[PDB]
Structures are given as C-alpha cells and as structure tokens.
C-alpha cells in the first residue's frame, strides 16, 4: 500500500531529584546532548528532534508502509534513551528520565500525533462522517491503558485510553485544549491543490509494535475506504464524544454506544464492520501483500479480544499493562487508588531498556515483536 504516513511524539520528561526543575530547560538540554553526541535538529534518518510545549518531540520521517512507520517510531524511542544516557554521562548532571506516554495523572496531557496524506478533492465532511466512528472505536485495539478515571483521575479504575478524558469536541482545530475526535488543521507542506494532510491527535503513544502497526495500517485503509466513496453513513454515532468515554472506561469490551440509527454496538462490532468493508475493498483491487497482512493482523486481534482480552497480553499495550496491574492488585490486595498501580502504569512507558516495564516484558519474551532490534537500530541512523 502507498499512503504517506508520519508520526510526531512528545515525550514526558522528569528529573526525580529536582522537584523545581524547569521542563523547558531539561528538554532543551536533552535535545542538545543528543545533537552534541551525534555532532530544531535534523537527525541522520530525516526525523526532527526539537523542543515543543516543554517536551522533547521526535518527528519520524514520512513512510508509506506502516511497518516502516512503526520501525522509525521505535527508533525515536531509542533516540530518547540515547539522549538521556548522554545527559547522564556528564559528571555532576542531574538524572533525566523520559516516558513515552501522554498524561501525568494530574491534569496535563501531551500528545502523539499521526499525519496521513489524502486527496484534496475528497470532501472533509465525508472524512468527518466516515472516520468518526472508526476513531472512536479503534482504542479497543490501540488503547495504551491508564490508571485513574477523569481528567484529574479522582475516580478509581482502569481505562483503555490515556487521551480519552481530554477529548471534548467532535471536530476542532486546537491541539492544546478542547481537543477533538477529528482535527481540522490544514497545512499540506505540498501541492494544496491535490493533496491534503489529515492530522490525528486522539491516539495514545504505543509501545507494543502490533498496537502501533494496527493504529497506522487500519487508519490508512479506512481512509482508502473514504476516498473511494464507499458508504459509511450507516455507522454514524449519536454522541461521539460521549462514546469515547464510554468505550474507554470498559476494559471488558462489552459496553455499547448508540448509533444515530438507534442501533447499539460495541467497539469490537464497529471494528469488525470496518474490517469487513476494508477487506471487500482490498479484495476488489490488485494484490497488495502489506494490506492483506494488515487485514490479517487486524482480524486476528479482533478475534482474540472477543475471545478474551488477556489473550492479547503479549500482543497489545493495554492488555499487557492490565495483566501487570491485575497481578499486583491480586498479590497485594490493592485498590485502584494504590500508588504502586500508578507507578506500574507510569513506568510501563519508561524508555530505559533495563527499567521500562514494557522493555522488560520484551526482554523476557512476554511481548510479541513484528520487527527486529537490528531494523530499529539501523533506522536510528538511516533514512527509510
């Protein structure tokens, strides 16, 4: 398949021994340390490493194959780790820790954005109508997991998505507040006559490679459905912003959301419908091994999630995180407000290979990988 895809990730950053640390200074020093180690900085890949909104931001080079996209996203994780290591190496330098996540559990949220190239001729009303239900429902596949419910997390519980509590409107332009399910930002950096750039801000940051792979591939294929003019009007939701919250806060995946036509569907059912229509589109065109592989992975994940969520605990981010959290809850007779559960949720995304809980699950073979570490490391220093 051939649709240009980009990703841009803002990493959380901290210095545990410096409560009064200024995040702008820490982010700037991380970026500068990485640039000095190598030699608004352009890496050798083509990615962009810079500071934005008091976070270090890594922007991957544009890719057409979602597998390349996931590889370069993981390369960004490695770049953050290397930057922290270079900062720590300076004698008398405060320790820096980075996290590939989206929230701090206190009310702040920083985002990992996706960018897709679409045709300028495609009406954006079609995009809104056809993409809103899919975007609302895809968190059951791509959700990263979060402990604490509500923007300030004052309600105990586990939910599927970090970003869900910070989505307020169905359509919007601003990314730092009143965030929307669809984002109307329009700067193509190309011929605006024929190409537009859709900007997605509802996704969590993902560690598991299957999660990222499906997040990018299925979104690309659904956009292909939109451009072809396939009809999706039957799938419009009654109250999409409410639907994001309802779906996020039910890890059992049995909660339903009302459609405009009065049907009530789970997120898995919506995903199955979109998968069916995408498969019909792909089968009607010339062979595309990558599209077929994405469809196969998507179908397998949907089947496994329907059978039992924990069957994806070595495949997807939020089931793996939930397996850890439930294990500790059982062992220590904890409640969802327990600080150690919050610590587990936070340290899952720590980009240190030896301390990040996801990285430990990968090391011990408790998490599937779609790509080899050799590919990721080669991507750290080469373009796609």
């Amino acid at each position: 398949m051939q649709r240009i895809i980009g990703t841009e990730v803002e990493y959380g950053i901290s210095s545990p021994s410096d409560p009064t640390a200024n995040p702008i200074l820490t982010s700037t020093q991380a970026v500068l340390a990485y640039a000095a180690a190598a030699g608004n900085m352009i890496l050798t890949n083509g990615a962009r490493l810079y500071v934005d909104h008091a976070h270090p931001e890594y922007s991957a080079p544009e890719c057409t194959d979602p597998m390349d996209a996931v590889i370069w996203d993981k390369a960004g994780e490695r770049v953050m780790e290397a930057a922290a290591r270079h900062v720590a190496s300076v004698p008398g330098a405060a320790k820096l820790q980075l996290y590939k996540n989206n929230v701090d559990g206190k009310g702040a949220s920083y985002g990992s954005h996706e960018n897709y190239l679409m045709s300028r001729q495609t009406p954006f009303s079609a995009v809104i109508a056809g993409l809103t239900p899919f975007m609302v429902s895809r968190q059951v596949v791509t959700g990263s997991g979060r402990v604490g419910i509500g923007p300030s997390g004052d309600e105990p519980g586990f939910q599927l998505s970090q970003r869900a509590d910070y989505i307020e409107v169905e359509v919007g332009l601003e990314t730092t507040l009143k965030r929307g399910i669809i984002n109307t930002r329009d700067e193509p950096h190309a011929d605006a006559d024929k190409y537009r750039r859709l900007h997605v801000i509802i996704g969590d940051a993902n560690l598991a490679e299957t999660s990222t792979y499906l997040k990018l591939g299925t979104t690309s294929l659904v956009l292909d459905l939109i451009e072809e003019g396939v009809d999706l009007s039957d799938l419009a939701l009654a109250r999409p912003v409410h639907a994001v919250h309802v779906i996020s806060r039910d890890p059992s995946l049995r909660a339903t959301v009302a459609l405009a036509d009065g049907r009530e569907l789970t997120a898995l059912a919506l995903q199955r419908i979109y998968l069916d229509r995408v498969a019909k589109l792909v089968d009607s065109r010339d062979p595309d091994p990558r599209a077929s592989h994405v469809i196969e992975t998507w179908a397998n994940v949907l089947d496994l999630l329907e059978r039992d969520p924990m069957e994806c605990a070595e495949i997807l981010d939020w089931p793996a995180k939930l397996r850890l959290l439930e294990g500790f809850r059982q062992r220590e007779n904890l409640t969802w407000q327990a600080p150690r559960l919050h610590l587990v949720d936070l340290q899952y995304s720590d980009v240190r290979l030896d301390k990040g809980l996801y990285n430990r699950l990968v090391a011990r073979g408790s998490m599937k990988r779609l790509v080899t570490e050799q590919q990721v490391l080669d991507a750290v220093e080469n373009p796609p």
């Binding site: 950053i13 545990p16 909104h53 559990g105 920083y110 150690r340 340290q347 301390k355």
Partner: peptide, 30 residues
C-alpha cells in the same frame, strides 16, 4: 508463570511509589 513475571517486575519498580508518583508533573502539550 505469573508469579515469576510479577517477581521480575516488582524487582525493578522504583522505590517510594507514592512520592515518585506525586513527583511526576508535566507541562500540557498538544
């Protein structure tokens, strides 16, 4: 198997969970 996984994870969890969690504060981004 789950006992081994939880042991290995628990050995790497950072000390003073409450304080470390309270310390993590971020500036809102996009």
């Amino acid at each position: 198997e789950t006992d081994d996984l939880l042991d290995e994870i628990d050995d790497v969890l950072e000390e003073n969970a409450e304080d470390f969690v309270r310390a993590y504060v971020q500036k809102g981004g996009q």
